[PDB]
Scaffold this active site. Sequence first.
Site, mmCIF file in Angstrom:
data_model
loop_
_atom_site.group_PDB
_atom_site.id
_atom_site.type_symbol
_atom_site.label_atom_id
_atom_site.label_comp_id
_atom_site.label_asym_id
_atom_site.label_seq_id
_atom_site.Cartn_x
_atom_site.Cartn_y
_atom_site.Cartn_z
ATOM 1 N N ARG A 153 1.369 -5.940 -8.201
ATOM 2 C CA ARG A 153 0.582 -7.018 -7.606
ATOM 3 C C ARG A 153 0.013 -7.948 -8.664
ATOM 4 N NH1 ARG A 153 -1.240 -3.418 -2.669
ATOM 5 N NH2 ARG A 153 -2.749 -2.308 -4.002
ATOM 6 N N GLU A 208 -0.652 -1.658 -8.068
ATOM 7 C CA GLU A 208 -1.584 -2.598 -8.679
ATOM 8 C C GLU A 208 -0.914 -3.309 -9.852
ATOM 9 O OE1 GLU A 208 -3.825 -3.314 -6.767
ATOM 10 O OE2 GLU A 208 -4.985 -1.627 -6.057
ATOM 11 N N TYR A 238 0.810 -1.202 0.000
ATOM 12 C CA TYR A 238 0.000 0.000 0.000
ATOM 13 C C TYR A 238 0.851 1.262 0.000
ATOM 14 C CZ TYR A 238 -4.310 -2.667 0.876
ATOM 15 O OH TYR A 238 -5.380 -3.517 0.776
HETATM 16 N N1 LIG Z 1 -1.293 1.135 -3.620
HETATM 17 C C1 LIG Z 1 -2.273 1.235 -2.813
HETATM 18 N N2 LIG Z 1 -2.151 2.114 -1.858
HETATM 19 C C2 LIG Z 1 -3.134 2.245 -0.989
HETATM 20 O O1 LIG Z 1 -2.906 3.198 -0.030
HETATM 21 C C3 LIG Z 1 -4.331 1.405 -1.087
HETATM 22 N N3 LIG Z 1 -5.393 1.426 -0.235
HETATM 23 C C4 LIG Z 1 -6.431 0.560 -0.456
HETATM 24 C C5 LIG Z 1 -7.672 0.479 0.472
HETATM 25 N N4 LIG Z 1 -8.960 0.788 -0.124
HETATM 26 C C6 LIG Z 1 -9.708 0.141 -1.201
HETATM 27 C C7 LIG Z 1 -10.825 0.810 -1.610
HETATM 28 C C8 LIG Z 1 -11.608 0.326 -2.642
HETATM 29 C C9 LIG Z 1 -11.303 -0.848 -3.304
HETATM 30 C C10 LIG Z 1 -12.197 -1.274 -4.410
HETATM 31 O O2 LIG Z 1 -13.189 -0.546 -4.692
HETATM 32 O O3 LIG Z 1 -11.969 -2.326 -5.046
HETATM 33 C C11 LIG Z 1 -10.168 -1.574 -2.902
HETATM 34 C C12 LIG Z 1 -9.363 -1.079 -1.850
HETATM 35 C C13 LIG Z 1 -6.386 -0.318 -1.561
HETATM 36 N N5 LIG Z 1 -5.368 -0.334 -2.385
HETATM 37 C C14 LIG Z 1 -4.327 0.443 -2.248
HETATM 38 N N6 LIG Z 1 -3.279 0.425 -3.050
#
Ligand SMILES: Nc1nc(O)c2nc(CNc3ccc(C(=O)O)cc3)cnc2[nH+]1
Length: 262
Positions: free
Chosen positions: A179, A176, A72
């Site tokens: 990943r 993403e 993240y």
């Molecule tokens: N690179 C990164 N950095 C972050 O800070 C981060 N935070 C999240 C939490 N929130 C979410 C919200 C919505 C969905 C979705 O709508 O699929 C997935 C994760 C997820 N993915 C993330 N990716």
Amino acid sequence: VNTIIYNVGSTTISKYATFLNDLRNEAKDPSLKCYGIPMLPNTNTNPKYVLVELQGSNKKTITLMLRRNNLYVMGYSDPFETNKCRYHIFNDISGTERQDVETTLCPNANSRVSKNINFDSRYPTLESKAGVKSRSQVQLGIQILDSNIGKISGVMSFTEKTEAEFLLVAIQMVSEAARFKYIENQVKTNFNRAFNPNPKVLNLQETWGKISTAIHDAKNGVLPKPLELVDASGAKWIVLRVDEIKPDVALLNYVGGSCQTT
Ligand SMILES: Nc1nc(O)c2nc(CNc3ccc(C(=O)O)cc3)cnc2[nH+]1
């Protein structure tokens, strides 16, 4: 902490591939892996972070701070004014981690300045700030990322929309894409243009944790239970085996416990 440098102002697809390859190799646990896919490390594993310096055009750069355990983005920094390093921590960062974002991004305590990201990193929040009901409406693309960096890097005041837009684009083309191999390929197939993230790229982003658990807990390659994802056309896509989702996965979220390593 190590930083992966990526020139967004001047690249090819092989450089993009190398970039993600270096971020995966750095992020992953040197040994944790389920079914031949590398797994992120346990939070207690050091280092706990990894940086991603995004070098845009016109000498506009932004550095992303990523947690290795779940990849993240915790915040970002940019060269500001003279010797300044402006760090922006996500509002969903708490405790020691907030000191870790500040010190890890801007090591020079003397010249670092703060500019908080007044919202969390959840897509619905980012989408809301970007003013879109879905990130599908925010095209991804190299030239686009470069342009979002320039709207923030060194600019004293940018809006939450401008900021969210940069975040949305960077989060998907960096973490993403790291990943998921599928997501990397989508960017590379449209390397020279803007493209809207399809239902599969978005679904993959939203079901990464589940997929990672499912694969970690898989028996002989059989997912504990059927996993319902969605393909590129936005159609129901039910996966029963690890062989069916594995091609699209590069890194697995850290999932505690032993698993069929290969
Ligand atoms: N690179 C990164 N950095 C972050 O800070 C981060 N935070 C999240 C939490 N929130 C979410 C919200 C919505 C969905 C979705 O709508 O699929 C997935 C994760 C997820 N993915 C993330 N990716």
